[PDB]
Ligand binder design. Structure first.
Ligand SMILES: *[B]([O])([O])[C]([C][C]([C])[C])[N]C(=O)[C]([C][C]([C])[C])[N]C(=O)[C]([C][C]([C])[C])[N]C(=O)O[C]C1=[C][C]=[C][C]=[C]1
Ligand SMILES: *[B]([O])([O])[C]([C][C]([C])[C])[N]C(=O)[C]([C][C]([C])[C])[N]C(=O)[C]([C][C]([C])[C])[N]C(=O)O[C]C1=[C][C]=[C][C]=[C]1
Lengths: 581, 133, 133, 128
């Protein structure tokens, strides 16, 4: 099918573009149902939990604002008192009562043991770590740098003695009765994971010393706190492998990477941006909300990384003189593309130069513009010339790039899948009477993935049938063994990448891309491409099957003979007779 | 039951039975029951919260479904993709040389999924090709 | 085969075989084994810029066709036998010119190269003069 | 412009006057010298000197800690809000080590890339 400009347009209509936006701030966790509820369970329950999600989602700021709304019992007076002249204990009192100093501190049993100094002339002070007014909002402590001294506190040395009073508190102490938030990465990096389990599992909390001369034994004590860990899916694996982890950290609070694209979340993003201090106009909200849809390559979802959105917004603001407008956002996007365009501008020059040989008009046998992406941020796409050559052979399909060690495993798997199709689909001669060689003509680099399977197979079929294919249409799609075409990824980059090549060489009017029907909802194409489609200057075909892609390329149908199919048969028969006479 | 009570739980007969059955379930054994007292306790502490301090059949069934919810993101993404046609699967009809096999994905908690499997045959010299291998 | 060629070198060799096999089909499969060597090389060689020299050499061995040894060759080839741009062109050309000048110029010496690399020719004066002469 | 990115050179240092210390024994670091203005560093150097994480903590969290020796009593010194624009300089390759760190792109949003070559024009001959 042909996809009309109307089918392609996915942007949000804008009305009153300059109007200021006025909106109240969404609560912490909007569009994050699962993570909110996990976190709620963990709070009502006293459980430790972990916050997991990809980078730049704003997991931290949401957690902190969410904890600021919590309320609980004002935190006890918290302290170290001596038991010996070499020993110290952690104690809790009911609050504020330690401005004091039987006696009326009966909770402090042992400190006996300040008991008989002048039965000798045998010639100290109880220390406070924390105290406080209210359990609203609770202690929330966020130590992003998880070193031992920062977690467990420290012992300093006053010349060379020490006593309770020289003991400095650590995050763990500051968080008693409340929250300690840590980064998964940091505990890993700082090799503090085991020592921190011992603090949770066994009450073990040891202030750091220097490599002498006399230390202080300090007893375990019961730990009062809820700890939340934050990091990525990947940040966690190192941890999970430790059966202790799941035991200690029962509640997973997972963020989704994407949100439904709904009015409520557009509206929510609007208030969220306003609370952040932006001066936002309706046009500036719509473009940003659409870029979020675009960032997720999902017409119906919107990318959930609030921090990425904010960062782009801060760029648009500068370009709009402090005002966040539809134009300033469209310009801050185009400037980011400009800032990273050097490699592409070199490619286009080379192509224009004939240094990279590409065709974008005309026809040729056994050649096709496939589409690749180059694997560094921001993942530009480009056409890559693909050739297929056929000769009398013993059912051999040669992937040249694989054989030379450039193809990856998935690339290899696609090549095998297509050979499964060819061998099985054409059987009159018994085994296939041809050797077919496939190359990505100017490639010097590893290529990996299955998204060139459709280009490979039409190229094969063209070489077998001697069938000239349109070079003004590029191809992307995976295939299965039955020759159905399967969805692939990075589609916007692929299409926009052939459009740049065509525009650099000068548009014919007939250029386009063929792609899987399966990827219709991923098309969130940039304006210039959409306009060109609206103008009849560029075209998008979507298919379900390899043979559909072939009929568009060879400008003919598989049957209604004079079809393509009888010519493919006639090619195979000829290759069969050459293989035995 | 007595072990849970000594631990301080307020346990009802329905809350014992569901937990004892989850233990059977955890061991994938109708006739055996998983012996990890600590796992059982940890689940029970979740059910208790959901039952307001009381450990009931419902609170256990709900504390189980919530654990599945807390780890369902990857599955909810898979189902969306399948519904979308992004993963091509068939669940009605017939076809030659195709079958829904079943796999599990190897991270806790080990969700299972169907995975489309195709077999193609041609005139050949006794060759069976495992493409994934 | 002896482990001196790199991956891109190998890829060029395969590309040219793709061309040969496909371009000459009367006999079915190609009725020849063709061996190619870089006669005094002891070291890794890598890149596709010898594909054009390799293929004319193949064609000469097949046809028994004597080739001019006063012209050197550089260029890559694709499967259709088109010649493709390569790199370090000034060094290549000026390098055959030194060899020829050291052995004493015939008057007829030169280099064949891809048309695609015309804009890369920024040849040193002595080479330009010799062309002028 | 601190081309040698060691901790003491970035964050400054604490010296010890016999064995005590106090505010007045605290020496400034590049980061302090650059407040309100520009700090230029080499990508390679932060890599080489293993100072990348400590420098993120200075930007991300205000964390700026003057170096001590392996005792006996230190000084706690609070974070403070950082006033500066930092520019990093290096090669395409010098950056990859860094980019792999999702923190990098977050902290260092604006890529300023030089082209390797210029058009050959009269204006650039004249400019040269
Ligand atoms: B498809 O699955 O999307 C597709 C199939 C290919 C075209 C046969 N694969 C890709 O586009 C992959 C993308 C993925 C690995 C990020 N691209 C590559 O493997 C590319 C291919 C070349 C032709 C650009 N290889 C690559 O990125 O690796 C080497 C390299 C990376 C960055 C810069 C320079 C070289
Ligand atoms: B059967 O023996 O149970 C079965 C046979 C398979 C389907 C042919 N094997 C599995 O289900 C194994 C389970 C075991 C290794 C834990 N699963 C896998 O090997 C899976 C298979 C895919 C299709 C899900 N591979 C896998 O888990 O590895 C990669 C990976 C793991 C986790 C997340 C993402 C990728």
């Amino acid at each position: 099918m042909r996809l009309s400009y109307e089918a392609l347009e996915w942007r949000t209509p804008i009305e009153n573009s300059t109007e200021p936006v006025s909106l109240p701030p969404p609560p912490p966790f909007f569009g994050q149902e699962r993570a909110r509820e996990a976190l709620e369970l963990a709070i009502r329950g006293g459980f430790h939990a972990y916050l997991v999600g990809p980078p730049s989602l704003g997991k931290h700021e949401a957690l902190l604002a969410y904890l600021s709304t919590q309320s609980v019992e004002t935190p006890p007076d918290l302290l170290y008192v001596p038991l010996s002249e070499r020993k110290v204990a952690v104690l809790t009192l009911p609050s504020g009562q330690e401005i004091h100093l039987f006696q009326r501190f009966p909770q402090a049993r042992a400190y006996e043991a300040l008991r008989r100094y002048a039965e000798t002339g045998e010639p100290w002070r109880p220390n406070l770590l924390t105290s406080s007014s209210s359990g609203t909002p609770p202690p929330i402590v966020y130590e992003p740098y998880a070193t031992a001294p920062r977690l467990f506190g420290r012992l300093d040395y006053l010349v060379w003695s020490t006593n309770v009073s020289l003991i400095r508190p650590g995050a763990v102490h500051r968080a008693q009765g409340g929250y300690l938030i840590l980064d998964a990465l940091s505990l890993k990096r700082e090799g503090t994971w085991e020592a921190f389990k011992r603090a949770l599992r066994n009450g073990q909390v040891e202030p750091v010393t220097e490599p002498a001369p006399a230390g202080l034994e300090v007893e375990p004590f019961p730990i009062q706190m809820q700890v939340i860990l934050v990091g990525t899916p990947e940040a966690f694996e190192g941890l999970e492998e430790d059966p202790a982890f799941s035991e200690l950290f029962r509640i997973r609070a997972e963020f989704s990477p994407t949100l439904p694209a709904s009015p409520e979340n557009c509206t929510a993003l609007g208030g969220w941006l306003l609370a952040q201090g932006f001066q936002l106009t309706q046009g500036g909200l719509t473009r940003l909300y659409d870029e979020a849809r675009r960032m997720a390559e999902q017409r119906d979802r919107m990318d959930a990384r609030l921090v990425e959105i904010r960062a782009l917004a801060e760029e648009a603001a500068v370009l709009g003189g402090g005002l966040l407008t539809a134009e300033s956002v469209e310009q801050a996007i185009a400037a980011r593309e400009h800032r990273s365009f050097l490699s592409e501008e070199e490619f286009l020059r080379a192509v224009q130069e004939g240094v990279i040989r590409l065709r974008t008009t005309g026809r040729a046998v056994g050649e096709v513009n496939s589409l690749v992406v180059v694997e560094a941020a921001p993942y530009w796409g480009r056409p890559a010339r693909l050739t297929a050559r056929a000769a009398p052979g013993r059912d051999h399909l040669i992937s040249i790039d694989r054989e030379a060690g450039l193809g990856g495993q998935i690339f290899h798997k696609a090549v095998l899948t297509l050979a499964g199709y060819l061998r099985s689909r054409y059987i009159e001669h018994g085994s296939l009477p041809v050797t077919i060689s496939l190359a990505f003509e100017q490639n010097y680099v590893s290529i990996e993935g299955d998204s060139a399977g459709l280009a490979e197979l039409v190229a094969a079929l063209s070489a077998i049938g001697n069938l000239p294919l349109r070079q003004d249409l590029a191809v992307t799609g995976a295939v299965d063994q039955t020759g159905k075409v399967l969805a692939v990824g990075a589609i916007n980059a692929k299409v926009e990448g052939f459009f740049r090549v065509c525009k650099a060489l000068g548009l014919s009017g007939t250029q386009g891309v063929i792609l899987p029907e399966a990827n219709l909802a991923n098309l969130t194409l940039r304006a210039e491409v959409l306009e060109a489609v609206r103008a009849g200057q560029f075209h998008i075909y979507a298919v379900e099957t390899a043979e559909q892609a072939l009929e568009i390329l060879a400008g003919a149908r598989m049957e209604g003979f004079r079809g393509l199919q009888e010519k493919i048969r006639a090619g195979l028969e000829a290759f069969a007779r050459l293989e035995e006479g």
